[PDB]
Design a protein around this ligand. Sequence first.
Ligand SMILES: *CCS(=O)(=O)NCc1ccc2[nH]ncc2c1
Length: 330
Amino acid sequence: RGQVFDVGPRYTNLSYIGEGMVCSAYDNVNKVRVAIKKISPFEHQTYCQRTLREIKILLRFRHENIIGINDIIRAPTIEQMKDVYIVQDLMETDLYKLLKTQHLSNDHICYFLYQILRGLKYIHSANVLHRDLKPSNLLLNTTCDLKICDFGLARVADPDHDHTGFLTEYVATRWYRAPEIMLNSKGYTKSIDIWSVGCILAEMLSNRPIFPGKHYLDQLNHILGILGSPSQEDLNCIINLKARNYLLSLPHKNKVPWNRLFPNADSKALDLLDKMLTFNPHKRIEVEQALAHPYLEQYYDPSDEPIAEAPFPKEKLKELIFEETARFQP
Ligand SMILES: *CCS(=O)(=O)NCc1ccc2[nH]ncc2c1
């Protein structure tokens, strides 16, 4: 152990996983090990907001490629409730850990990408944006089943309020941020997630992040270094003068061909990558088009790619977390 990890007698024999804190544990009712994360969010409003949003989303979603919540453990009263524990299916590894050690065959890349997009189709069908897709948020088991996790930054899509100024600060993981985040976008459209998936695909191809920016504007430097300078048409879509004039200030950069960056990659994988890593978010491929792409033809089956049945102050938010978790109480 490290601290109080107080999960009733249902869950026993705890092993540390990572870091609030995550442990595996034996579930004495279902007779399997499970993952459990301790969330002590109530002293920080940021952790509380992300806790409630995640719980609400994950309890509504039901999909093979999205991690569920199996159980939530907390004290019987608001006064006694200092922590919440979320119990989820235990997955042996994640794509971040796997890519640090293992070469993926083209077949593995294809199947992982299929499952990411299949999960994402469901999320987007519920009018939700994940907004922090990255290898460590893709859980894997030993048979290569994949589950999307961490909905702490997820939002309902809101394309009419997507516009913002140049260099607006952003929360989600830097290396997977679409170029428009740095230029004119709050990340309130589905195209933000597709860019992250493109980055993940590129990372699966070479085991290295494609755009490892070291700070905020360096991320755009990395993206433009491979895509090259945006076209006049793509620039004309950027009405914000600060962002536009920044881009016009840069020396001309040529496109680096994908087949030079990824000489061992399948050509169909690179055609799909090109379409996910499109600079102009309006021209970027959508999740259903991505699934229908020739690269995924061995798996594509829209009848087996389900969609969601419908669209989706700390003191009141501790109350809302209490209410939302009530169904798991004895
Ligand atoms: C979803 C990525 S984190 O939440 O950062 N990692 C913690 C978890 C959560 C659920 C798991 N199931 N198996 C392993 C897990 C790790």
